[PDB]
């Protein structure tokens, strides 16, 4: 058994739908055969995928980061725009592959207008600096009547893009980025970077680097510096976490997004220790831009050789278990809506992604592509503080792990309130009893479940075994909703009314 | 109208009954003439003021810090202890008095004995350091067989004091303070003094110094920097906070602790930043160790000429708006109960207090005695998670401050919850509604007020025209608390059944 | 030193262990005659520093007429102990040592003591400490900088190691 109370008075924030973000990197087939595939079947006039297209739309993505990730390190942007006959082939050193650059900013820019998608742009300070980063946001950005904004309508692209979000640089707090800075170095460009930003378009809004991730041996040090050096001109602080379940131990996978849970705690704490030494009324929040599973493709990535034109890396295909820790990892952003106001699944088409496609074949959805659907499509409103009594279980490396991974979202002008539920239990069914009075005359309208009895199963071109179902059970009876969530289950039990 | 729900399980935490300590220090009247005063017609057979006992007993204060505050970083333990004739006259740089010694450690902790409280021992970190250290906790707490246990022994003490929770220094990023260390310099010797008391004994605690206030300069640099020094082997790091009305702007100054909310919210933030830095399992606590109103007294403190004994020193008179602030002061703890497990009104006795002596003459209760009075004896339990729907007005300092100040503490045991709960407004009865729906059965017992139309009218030894009475008006009908907080008013409603 | 009346029981911190200082450093240079051996005396940078330091060396090395060494006549030892070779500390780097220092305040405080102990006796050697194994996150960084501070006051740089077969 476990309870939970559903209290309409009881809220944690707004969520902010840039939580159902996503990341498109110039990395294997994410772009050149993913997104983009001229000649395809479902090809469009300028190249696109129509079938991608749809499947992102159903996803409804808010916002998308673009083009890195490793790869903007080394990247220059005016490689990627005019015509096609001058821009030049270049060794990226972050994946070691030839970009033809055949797609730059201009042609992502179309194909996130047909996603219904903003993007989050990022440019480089690792081999580049203020001015690159001045100069691109007035490329993009400013109306007309200087060299840069004229050269991207002679591009083709008459109005211009008006991008409100940017990252400054990728994580270089990493050993293996391309122009690597210590959080000092880093902290400095970044500022003046910033700085210079804002003076071409007040109206943008800026993410800083946070850690590459929470075992780099700078972690912590490196948000406190960073933001030392930022506070003022910055508005988010970034995270990046990868999991993957190497040693084969579902109960302490699942457990993971508990660690998820301290770490976003505890850049929370770093943005607000900063904003008392700078005594500032401004709250800096986070963009969690880079989160998934990311493990299944590490050996394969081994064999290919280098300098090729889009090869098949990270090429994740997810399980069951995947799909159960995404929505652990979902629950746990919403669970944070009053400070994570971006988030990023990594990535959104081949790699380490929710939707995969074949060369002049199909495209399909992933077994995480549901609970981040789910997600994404019923998780818009006011997330709702849970006050859970749940049994527990130990692991190896967790304690006092909740069997119900647990949120409701309030979403009162549909008038709707909808619980997301992981049941962590590898034998046991959970009897979930939320209690409902707040919510005056609301009725059961569906009951959604993801299961399947084996971990390890996942999906392909050819059969998608793991799909989700109608046929929960839960129902409303004396201000009271009574559910049964089955055995490593993800549930979405929608309220209305 | 403001509205609140009380829900037994919307809890922030068991709450630490140190919250509701003080603080003595050898400044001006606090000991000589405070506690101890061998003339008085009430001394006991220790010359220890009876009076004073009954007025410290009946606020039930758990702990007490000694013997500073500015005065432990010039103090030698050793002056104070052994044959009253070797014990020599000292001038403290502190308070520019001369201290004759005759109160030392071992005669506070006979007077702490009598009046039920356990002693928050202050080490000298000033002009003294690590072999200081363990030489007293090894006096204080160490049983028998060595040099300084057989010395206690000597000195009238058979049984070791054994002192639980000991303060590592006083704050030393103050330049006037004696022997003022740098964040780092006192990291460094408050680490290595950690460790050597705990060797001496492992069952005690340490207290790490905060920042003398949020005004500092080098405010939360410092927690950051000390923390980072220190983690290991220390349990809380303390903060520092005095409020006067200097511009006589009541509704600014009752709004005060909004600030004092953010400013526990950024300690708690430094801690946790530097926990994830160092990856420790431990969380690290907050000793709010010195908070009070002081401001009155500064004027005629500066006409005081040097090195006379026992000058009157920091003599504040509080008034009736001082007492809202302290109430509110008090509700702000507990609504950090989860983080705050030590705090200490500064000071007890005579000095910015709310008890005051005359010599040869009465012992009376300051207006801020009552609020302290009613948070230490009825804020045992539980402390609930407000959810407050209040009205709120702007001053100077503050926008969006609610006229309601309020928290519910539930005392399982006892089968009691207390409502505490300040209104702010200077000129309108707020109607206070509480959803007790969790709470079966229970009934108010009684509706405490503390009132008077004139938010300037002190307390004195001749009359007090500040003092609570019991004419409240809540009732609970149909699981509803309806209660009427007259304007300008603390209020305590009891429950049970 | 001194009467044994007069020496202290004493928590050492080290071994949590009480040392009743029965034995003593004068005591210790009686056995370690009978043994044939010479002694390499280590001084107290931990807790204590350079008055200590040069006192000691006076103690035990100075021949007469000055307080240290007349002390050292009174409490039984005619001759000068005269001992050749002191360890300035005991390795300061590990956090489980009393009075731990880093590299720049060890070699700060281990450049003024070999100073003064110099000034008291030119014939005496100085070893500095370096790491407490070769494993400690400082070593190597540890003894450049220990070096850099020390360098033309002290003679010779220690090493420390202990194995095991625990597998
Ligand atoms: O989303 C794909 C990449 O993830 C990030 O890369 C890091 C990876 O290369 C390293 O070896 O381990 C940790 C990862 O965070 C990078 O931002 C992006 O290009
Ligand atoms: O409780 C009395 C004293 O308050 C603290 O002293 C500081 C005071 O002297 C300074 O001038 O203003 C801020 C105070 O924090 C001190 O800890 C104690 O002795």
């Known amino acids: 058994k476990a309870t939970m109370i559903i209290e309409k008075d009881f809220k944690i924030a707004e969520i902010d739908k840039r939580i159902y973000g996503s990341f498109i990197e110039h990395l294997g087939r994410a772009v050149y055969g993913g997104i983009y595939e001229p000649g395809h079947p ?23 980061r673009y083009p890195g990730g490793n790869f903007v390190s080394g990247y220059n942007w005016e490689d990627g725009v005019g015509p ?11 994946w070691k592959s030839v970009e033809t650059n055949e797609i730059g900013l201009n042609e992502f820019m179309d194909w996130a207008k047909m996603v219904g998608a903003e993007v989050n742009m990022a440019v480089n300070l690792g081999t580049r600096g203020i001015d690159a980063a001045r100069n691109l946001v007035e490329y993009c950005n400013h109306p007309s009547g200087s060299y840069y904004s004229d050269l991207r309508i002679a591009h083709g692209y008459k109005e211009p893009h008006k991008i409100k979000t940017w990252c400054l640089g990728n994580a270089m707090d990493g050993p293996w980025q391309i122009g690597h800075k210590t959080a000092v170095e880093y902290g400095r460009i970044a500022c003046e970077a910033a700085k210079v930003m804002k003076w071409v378009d007040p109206t943008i809004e800026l993410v800083v680097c ?19 050096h930022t506070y003022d001109h910055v508005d988010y602080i970034s995270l990046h976490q990868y999991y993957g379940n190497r040693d084969n131990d579902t109960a302490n996978y699942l457990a993971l997004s508990l660690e998820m849970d301290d770490f976003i705690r505890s850049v929370v704490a770093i943005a607000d220790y900063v904003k008392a030494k700078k005594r500032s009324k401004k709250t800096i929040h986070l963009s969690f831009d880079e989160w998934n599973v990311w493990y299944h493709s590490n050996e394969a990535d081994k064999l290919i050789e280098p300098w090729t034109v889009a090869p098949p890396l ?25 400070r994570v106001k971006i988030a990023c699944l990594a990535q959104l088409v081949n790699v380490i992604a929710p939707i995969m496609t074949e060369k002049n074949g199909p495209a399909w959805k992933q077994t995480i592509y549901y609970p981040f659907m789910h997600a994404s499509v019923y998780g818009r409103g006011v997330a709702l503080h849970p006050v859970i009594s749940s049994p527990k ?25 909808t619980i997301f539920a992981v049941n962590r239990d590898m034998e046991d069914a959970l009897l979930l009893e939320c209690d409902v009075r707040s919510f005056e005359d609301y009725r059961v309208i569906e009951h959604i479940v993801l299961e399947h009895d084996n971990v ?22 004396d201000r009271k909703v009574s559910a049964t969530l089955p055995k490593l289950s993800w549930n979405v039990i929608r309220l209305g009314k």
Chains 1, 2 share one sequence.
Not at 319 to 326: G, S, T, W
Not at 462 to 475: L, M, T, Y
């Open 84 to 94: 096609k006959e001058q821009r030049p082939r270049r060794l990226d050193l972050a």
């Open 210 to 228: 946070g850690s590459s991730n929470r075992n780099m041996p700078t972690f912590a040090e490196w948000e406190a510096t960073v933001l030392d």
């Open 314 to 338: 990270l090429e994740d295909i997810y399980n069951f278990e995947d799909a159960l820790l995404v929505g652990c990892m979902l629950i746990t952003l919403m669970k944070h809506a009053d």
């Open 456 to 477: 390890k199963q996942t999906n392909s071109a050819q059969s998608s075994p793991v799909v989700p179902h109608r046929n929960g059970d839960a129902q409303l009876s």
């Open 393 to 417: 279980y130990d692991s190896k490396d967790f304690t006092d792990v909740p069997y119900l991974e647990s949120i409701a979202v309030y979403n009162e002008e549909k008038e709707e309130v």
């Open 42 to 64: 479902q090809a469009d006039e300028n190249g696109f995928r129509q079938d991608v297209i749809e499947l992102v739309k159903e996803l409804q993505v808010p916002i998308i």
